Amino acid sequence: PKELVNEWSLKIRKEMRVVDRQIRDIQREEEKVKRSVKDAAKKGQKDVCIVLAKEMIRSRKAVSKLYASKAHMNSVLMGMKNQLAVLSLQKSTEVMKAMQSLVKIPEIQATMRELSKEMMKAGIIMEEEAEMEIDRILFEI
Numbered sequence: 550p551k552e553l554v555n556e557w558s559l560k561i562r563k564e565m566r567v568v569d570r571q572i573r574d575i576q577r578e579e580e581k582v583k584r585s586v587k588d589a590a591k592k593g594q595k596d597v598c599i600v601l602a603k604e605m606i607r608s609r610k611a612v613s614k615l616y617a618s619k620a621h622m623n624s625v626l627m628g629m630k631n632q633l634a635v636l637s638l639q640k641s642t643e644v645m646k647a648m649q650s651l652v653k654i655p656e657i658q659a660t661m662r663e664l665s666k667e668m669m670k671a672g673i674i675m676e677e678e679a680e681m682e683i684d685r686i687l688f689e690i
Contacts, residue, residue, distance in 0.1 A: 550638050550672060557664060558629045564657045565622050568615055571656060575612050579605065583690055590687070602683035618654045621647045628673070638672030645674035 582601050589597035628644030635641075648668065652661040668674065 551633070553667065553672075554629050554632050557667070558626060560660065560664060561622055561626055561629070564660060565619060565626075567656055568619050568622065568654075572612050572615050575608050575615070579608050582608070586687070586690055598687055599683060602686055605686050606679070606682050614654070618651065618657065621651045625651070632673070641673045644668070 582604055586598055586601045586605070589601065624647040625644050628641045628647070631641060632638065648661060648665050652658065652665060654661075
């Protein structure tokens, strides 16, 4: 199954773009929240700042989880590079676990699980102090 790899690669790579895109937006959005946060600071609106702040943390986590996804994707792409050399299809216990952590990202969430079948077939398988992070970013901006 050399034919499969080439397509899968492409699919995987295509989701990678979605991932870059989604990040590009979240960041474009943080540019803005940053400004608001400042404005609200200058006008002494504490509650607007705290709130927007939670918006910011939420973003950072969002983006991070995304870059983590990009990694997982590359692990899987690598596994594809490999599958080419492994004289057939061997059960790369690597591209197993990555594609198990990948079927849990909203946007790529759907497809992945379907690629996971195509593969599994005849081949491979207290944040209570996060009330301190906000107070941090406020300061950090």
